[PDB]
Design an enzyme around this catalytic site. Structure first.
Site, PDB file in Angstrom:
ATOM      1  CE1 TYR A 107      -3.831  -2.097  -0.464  1.00  0.00           C
ATOM      2  CE2 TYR A 107      -3.655  -2.617   1.860  1.00  0.00           C
ATOM      3  CZ  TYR A 107      -4.254  -2.818   0.638  1.00  0.00           C
ATOM      4  OH  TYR A 107      -5.264  -3.752   0.551  1.00  0.00           O
ATOM      5  CG  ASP A 152      -4.214 -12.114   7.026  1.00  0.00           C
ATOM      6  OD1 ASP A 152      -4.696 -13.212   7.385  1.00  0.00           O
ATOM      7  OD2 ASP A 152      -4.837 -11.437   6.194  1.00  0.00           O
ATOM      8  CG  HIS A 190       3.337  -7.685  -1.156  1.00  0.00           C
ATOM      9  ND1 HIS A 190       4.388  -7.659  -0.266  1.00  0.00           N
ATOM     10  CD2 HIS A 190       2.241  -7.244  -0.477  1.00  0.00           C
ATOM     11  CE1 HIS A 190       3.946  -7.217   0.896  1.00  0.00           C
ATOM     12  NE2 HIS A 190       2.644  -6.975   0.786  1.00  0.00           N
ATOM     13  CE1 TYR A 198      -9.084  -3.515   1.196  1.00  0.00           C
ATOM     14  CE2 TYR A 198     -10.162  -2.347   3.002  1.00  0.00           C
ATOM     15  CZ  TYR A 198      -9.164  -3.183   2.541  1.00  0.00           C
ATOM     16  OH  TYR A 198      -8.220  -3.655   3.418  1.00  0.00           O
ATOM     17  NE  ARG A 199      -5.004   0.342   3.193  1.00  0.00           N
ATOM     18  CZ  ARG A 199      -4.262   0.044   4.242  1.00  0.00           C
ATOM     19  NH1 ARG A 199      -4.633  -0.853   5.147  1.00  0.00           N
ATOM     20  NH2 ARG A 199      -3.107   0.719   4.322  1.00  0.00           N
TER      21      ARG A 199
HETATM   22  N1  LIG Z   1      -2.810   9.001  13.149  1.00  0.00           N
HETATM   23  C1  LIG Z   1      -3.121   9.057  11.882  1.00  0.00           C
HETATM   24  N2  LIG Z   1      -3.806  10.150  11.485  1.00  0.00           N
HETATM   25  C2  LIG Z   1      -4.158  10.282  10.162  1.00  0.00           C
HETATM   26  N3  LIG Z   1      -3.906   9.419   9.198  1.00  0.00           N
HETATM   27  C3  LIG Z   1      -3.219   8.374   9.647  1.00  0.00           C
HETATM   28  C4  LIG Z   1      -2.800   8.137  10.936  1.00  0.00           C
HETATM   29  N4  LIG Z   1      -2.136   7.019  11.056  1.00  0.00           N
HETATM   30  C5  LIG Z   1      -2.144   6.537   9.871  1.00  0.00           C
HETATM   31  N5  LIG Z   1      -2.769   7.273   8.926  1.00  0.00           N
HETATM   32  C6  LIG Z   1      -3.097   6.888   7.575  1.00  0.00           C
HETATM   33  O1  LIG Z   1      -3.061   5.534   7.428  1.00  0.00           O
HETATM   34  C7  LIG Z   1      -2.243   5.162   6.297  1.00  0.00           C
HETATM   35  C8  LIG Z   1      -1.696   3.770   6.603  1.00  0.00           C
HETATM   36  O2  LIG Z   1      -0.469   3.830   7.295  1.00  0.00           O
HETATM   37  P1  LIG Z   1       0.135   3.036   8.506  1.00  0.00           P
HETATM   38  O3  LIG Z   1      -0.253   3.459   9.864  1.00  0.00           O
HETATM   39  O4  LIG Z   1       1.611   3.189   8.407  1.00  0.00           O
HETATM   40  O5  LIG Z   1      -0.255   1.499   8.205  1.00  0.00           O
HETATM   41  P2  LIG Z   1      -0.044   0.148   9.068  1.00  0.00           P
HETATM   42  O6  LIG Z   1      -0.319   0.344  10.501  1.00  0.00           O
HETATM   43  O7  LIG Z   1      -1.177  -0.723   8.346  1.00  0.00           O
HETATM   44  O8  LIG Z   1       1.366  -0.256   8.891  1.00  0.00           O
HETATM   45  C9  LIG Z   1      -1.228   6.304   6.194  1.00  0.00           C
HETATM   46  O9  LIG Z   1      -0.677   6.412   4.864  1.00  0.00           O
HETATM   47  C10 LIG Z   1      -2.227   7.476   6.448  1.00  0.00           C
HETATM   48  O10 LIG Z   1      -3.053   7.489   5.267  1.00  0.00           O
END
Ligand SMILES: Nc1ncnc2c1ncn2[C@@H]1O[C@H](COP(=O)(O)OP(=O)(O)O)[C@@H](O)[C@H]1O
Ligand SMILES: Nc1ncnc2c1ncn2[C@@H]1O[C@H](COP(=O)(O)OP(=O)(O)O)[C@@H](O)[C@H]1O
Ligand SMILES: Nc1ncnc2c1ncn2[C@@H]1O[C@H](COP(=O)(O)OP(=O)(O)O)[C@@H](O)[C@H]1O
Lengths: 545, 545, 545
Positions: B93, B155, B407, B488-489
């Site tokens: 992503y 997962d 991926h 969806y994403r």
């Molecule tokens: N605290 C937050 N406030 C606003 N947007 C957020 C916040 N945390 C994450 N995001 C959003 O979520 C997306 C997914 O990121 P991330 O937290 O790194 O994913 P994961 O926890 O699935 O590794 C970021 O690119 C941003 O779009």
């Protein structure tokens, strides 16, 4: 037509007449009434405040979505506030009265009435503002869907399926959280443009048969009503309890027949048994033994269904603790009363029901009943239909507690804790007493919260009592806020006061709502004041209550 | 620090140095890196696109909420774009890479890490960006809550609980829809002001002990985390998948121990059994016999957990239909594989489990297994922990299908109909074949919809295959939109493409989203481009992909 | 100087250094301090709130009016908030601390110190911010005016004559209402222009000797200080308790020697005698037998002048009703104590004094004393000088009730009715008890109203008691507003709370005040937040307490 009792802010009589002739030319004189079972659409029916307050200038019933777009066009041209309604049956929240006088009430239900689509494999329907719960019911019965799909109805059935859902109401089945069951809504914005949410924005692919249809009349893509989120910002919620748009269509998820149903009643002998009962209900709701939204009614609620106050006493002052016990005995009910229901195959029902009974057995003198074990006129018989999606008109009998009764709902939220519920009941009970009114209410059990509906009933023609009701209502709002509880919905005169309650960090929540509303409604013509949110051209000093 | 590889749009090197010294003076040099297990926070790791794209200028790690406020202040002063992340682990992503180069990645998890509150009677927790699923797990085990409250994990366990939930991820227990389990979020808006949603706006009443605390550090009122709606517009959704604000805190509902758990595996012999399997799953999901979010995995997904491609074949081109069968056999799995779980007392489990088996018995050669009936290394042993909220790192093995694999997820939504699932599968399998890649994927079963994760794996250093990967992706996006399905994403490079897909009525959806964003972010400093949503100062001509 | 602890909103460190070198170049380095008996000018001394709150960035001491003009010029250029003080001695109202951190405190008393004019036939003086009451006293004694003109002093003599008067303080002689004795003020507005009110706008006619003087240094016309109204709008009041301008000069009316003076003390035995005493005071004040502003002090106020708490008890919790009686006895005072004074020829004094005694004779056990009848250290000996305009430092002993005491004033207004006084006293005594503090206070008797100073004393290093102090204060504010009483003045942290209390008709009062302030201070650089009044560039969400 020519001379209204009240004109919208800043508008001349000439402007007013020019507009009305334009709307009359679009929807026909038959769908435009000027103010110079059968719910009124012109004024607050549960009069609490007085004259000049919440009085429409005209009622306008659009023939269809295009008409809504032309009427929006004209409100933007003339600066005429609109107040959109679907049915206007909920006196107690102020029926169809507009928050600002001079508004044009927009009766969406009169002509945009259609059950648009009942889809069996997806288990959903698509609906217009005008489909009441009764109408969706008859729709199912005339197409044989009664034994495949069930509805989810609020205590009375003449409300609007979409109306109820956008205001976030609650029903008594496993699908009781109406708002949470929606997917794919069509909205006319303040600019007049049509918008569809979630997967409703993903268009149905082109095909010979659906070519040239106006946007409004186009079909939806396959996942429109099966997955609510679409992609990006999920904006659906800006349309519940807001003035951000005019809802024209909405898909609501339907629960398929569970192949097993048993409704029930659990009577709690003492006024104080509410505390242990709520502590009992908590783990059971959170652990899923309690399938639907179960309710906890106070004795006078069932009492009033069955008879007016004069039929139980001559007293003009509040019935006492003693009399309440006697009424309980008279009907075979408890002081508090739990209604709920089991859904599914017998083998599953049974286990749930042995756990339920088992848990409520620790309350002395508790008594368990199925419909059949109770009088013909009983509430359980009526509620037996309510919890299986069948709509009724029965429970409307309580509105008539007092003579020329009108009622209002004080509706705070409580934790699912015996201690919290007893604390909230005490605060309401004192104040109701101080005002000379019987305390009447229910608790509807959510999964981790309780919706407490206090039904304040009073005499619509009594100046002195209406003022007591106004004093009760605002004092309860403050008392409840000083105990950390907020209301989930109110009548037009308490919107400001209730929104002022959600003022954490100096009213950040409302400030931010103000920004979104001026951005999308620059003339401020879509229901100014709904939920205490006012566009910039409506001075707070002039309009708030 | 002095000279970045890439500077944000229109900003001088002098401005940039001025800002960075300001931020360094606020959070300390140890929390500010300039770009001149352990996820990268500076660039897209699953390289698909090329250089200059999605490259940060600096990473900034606030110590707390005040620090995020000051950093917002300075972005508005200097017009610097911020890209807020929680963890940044979801390569596929685009991990933590910013959509626009020159952005400052705001690492919120490094210091704002706390498990703020685990409340048992309410059955919720309250969390900061930094709490990963592993972290919330250990938090529970160290306070004895393991046999009272369970988690819900995606997962892989290293993602962020709040991060995953604002992005709307899905888990495999009854509380699988993460976003739908939230209640009460704290947000730092683009103006810099703090905001708390729903009953989080209703303040905790004054008390001696909580006087003088900064807004950020104040407790919440009692229903904050028990009722998500509050009063008026429900705005929560404006913060999911959006660039509307910076999420600082969030409350998620926890599912209490159900006193009964059995996970299972149903192997489907043939590639074409997906169709009858999905028709079988439909009524059962809708009638509630299927308790969690059940999954339907393709043979290579389980294959890839257990071993790289080389370990099943020398082939460099896609494995064939025949080989897939042989791999199935080798592992004792089917061509498609259904994972699921029974929750609750034995009496209830048993009836659900006789109904489940019964229904899948109509698929020839079907085979039913409990964890214990399978090899030590099996997926079901792993997923047995996943479906009871216990996080793991196991399934990460598949990322290494190919040597220097990276991926991306192609993520469309399908109906819960065998027919629709087979049609979507066909469209994705052809295209993967035309690109020379193995088809790898799952379908995660929503109540009335299926989330179809196609996992495109390729070699991150191969110019020729990356391009085929870019060609696959955008062709899939259109193909799917031509069949009525949306994603969806997605990853940073498909955001504009996928938003363009939700264009009903001439892009109404995105137009309206543009209005809200410019209203609340007049300098456009909060994540320009998230979801295809661009503030007015970012020319579409210049920035869209 | 280079690096402050806190910088004003939105200002860089470079801007800040540029400004400071500019100011240093105007007033000299010895008059500009940067924050990296002898009152502090940098922070709130009566710490109640915590760090980061009310902390200056620099103190700047103009040499004269031109210097204030140049400093205003530079605040408008750079957008730097100024906080103008005269003396800064009133800890309890927050001394000289600025309401917003990063402000430059403008110390006007250090150099603009002059007694400008003492005019005998007109019976007025003309003063600069720096003239303290001690200073005006010595000014009179050195020019023989002591037996022609008398002052009017607040309980402590080190405050500023003009400072006290623009803040509307009260004294204990017939000219006790300070603000009401002003006439002809010189103001530096936020645009930088000089302005003189009332007949100060009517210029002194040209004459050879006053040609070429700067505006600031010009004489005033003859009625300047004899008639306060001038012609047209009387704007004077916009400068009291406001952030409308920077007061440079002021004329105060002096009361000539009355040729007769007798101060006295009337002790009231019982805690409940306050009620009859206040009913007795009512007609006498209104009928003019009571000449000055008489005071009614609580036993611990006089107790505390004479000695710390430890000197009357070991107790750490509040002294009891019984102990209070014993303390009364020990000192020869009552539970409540009335101080007052007779002015004028003997024949007149005598009749007033027979009417006074007569009226208070109806209170059992009442006792009448002249200075001479009391101990050397008595309060009446001290207050004998206070009620004839002679300043002292004596009463400052009470600040030290507790060890590292700091105090704050809770200052409500009550009717001159025994009933209302007892009701207000009850509300304040409960709350002080619930916080674990001794109730200490006075009532100063206006003509038709009473100023009730509650003196909350606590330990400035105790986290737990400071919070109880913050809880007391805000609860008192609401309690008092729920009983119809407002505060007349408060400390920097209660300013927003107390202004919110004056919200009749949806905050009309403050809305209108916001209009005037934004009109005259478009950059919002004059004391943002004074009295809860905020210019448009100071978000309420961000700055209100
Ligand atoms: N605290 C937050 N406030 C606003 N947007 C957020 C916040 N945390 C994450 N995001 C959003 O979520 C997306 C997914 O990121 P991330 O937290 O790194 O994913 P994961 O926890 O699935 O590794 C970021 O690119 C941003 O779009
Ligand atoms: N179609 C709609 N679009 C926007 N707001 C609506 C719409 N329908 C109803 N509302 C809102 O719902 C409120 C409740 O009214 P109503 O539909 O008449 O209730 P009911 O169906 O429960 O009788 C109205 O005051 C209005 O705020
Ligand atoms: N010359 C002035 N011009 C404008 N406001 C002033 C001036 N002097 C004092 N103030 C106001 O009066 C308040 C009281 O301060 P101060 O003079 O220090 O008190 P005191 O003389 O009672 O020690 C200041 O916070 C400011 O609000």
């Amino acid at each position: 037509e020519f001379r209204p009792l009240t004109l919208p802010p800043k508008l001349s009589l000439s402007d007013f007449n020019e507009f009305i002739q334009d709307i009359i030319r679009i929807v026909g004189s038959e769908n435009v009434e000027v103010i110079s079972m059968k719910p009124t659409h012109t004024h607050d029916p549960t009069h609490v405040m007085d004259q000049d307050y919440f009085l429409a200038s005209a009622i306008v019933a659009p023939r269809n979505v295009a008409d809504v777009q032309s009427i929006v066009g004209l409100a933007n041209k003339f600066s005429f506030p609109l107040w959109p309604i679907s049915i206007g049956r909920n006196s107690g929240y102020g029926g169809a009265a507009p928050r600002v006088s001079g508004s044009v009430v927009l009766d969406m239900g009169k002509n945009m009435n259609r059950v648009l689509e009942v889809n069996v494999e997806g288990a959903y329907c698509v609906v217009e503002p005008g489909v009441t719960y009764h109408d969706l019911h008859n729709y199912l019965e005339a197409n044989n869907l009664r034994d495949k799909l069930w509805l989810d109805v609020p205590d009375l059935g003449g409300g609007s399926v979409l109306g109820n859902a956008v205001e976030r109401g609650v029903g008594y089945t496993p699908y009781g959280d109406h708002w949470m069951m929606h997917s794919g809504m069509e909205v006319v914005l303040a600019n007049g443009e049509l918008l569809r949410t979630g997967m409703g924005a993903l268009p149905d692919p082109k095909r010979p048969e659906t070519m040239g249809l106006k946007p409004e009349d186009q079909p939806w893509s396959k996942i429109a009503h099966l997955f609510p989120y679409g992609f990006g910002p999920y904006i659906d919620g800006l349309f519940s309890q807001s003035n951000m748009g005019i809802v024209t269509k909405i898909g609501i998820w339907l629960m398929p027949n569970p192949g097993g149903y048993q409704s029930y009643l659990i009577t709690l002998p003492k006024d104080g048994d509410l505390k242990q009962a709520v502590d009992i209900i908590r783990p059971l709701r959170l652990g899923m033994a309690l399938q639907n939204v179960p309710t906890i009614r106070h004795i006078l609620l069932d009492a009033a269904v069955l008879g007016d106050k004069r039929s139980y006493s001559s007293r003009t002052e509040p019935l006492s603790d003693e009399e309440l016990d006697k009424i309980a005995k008279q009907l075979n009910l408890g002081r508090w009363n739990f209604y709920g229901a089991l859904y599914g195959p017998e083998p599953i029902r049974r286990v749930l029901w042995e756990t339920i009974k088992d848990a409520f057995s620790a309350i002395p003198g508790v008594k368990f009943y199925f419909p059949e074990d109770t009088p013909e006129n009983s509430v359980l018989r009526v509620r037996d239909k309510t919890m299986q999606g069948i709509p009724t008109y029965d429970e409307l009998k309580w509105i008539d507690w007092l003579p020329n009764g009108a009622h209002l709902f004080f509706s705070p939220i409580a934790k699912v804790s015996g201690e919290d519920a007893m604390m909230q009941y005490a605060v309401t009970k004192k104040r109701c007493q101080e005002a000379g009114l019987d305390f009447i209410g229910t608790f509807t059990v959510g999964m981790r919260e309780m919706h407490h509906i206090v039904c304040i009933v009073f005499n619509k023609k009594d100046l002195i009592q209406k003022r007591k009701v106004q004093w009760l209502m605002r004092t309860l709002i403050d008392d409840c806020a000083a105990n950390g509880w907020g209301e989930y919905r109110t009548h037009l005169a308490f919107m400001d006061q209730i929104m002022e309650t959600y003022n954490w960090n100096n009213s950040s929540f409302l400030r931010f709502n103000e920004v979104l509303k001026n951005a999308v409604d620059p003339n401020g013509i879509i229901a100014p004041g709904k939920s205490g949110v006012w566009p910039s051209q409506y001075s707070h000093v002039t309009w708030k209550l």
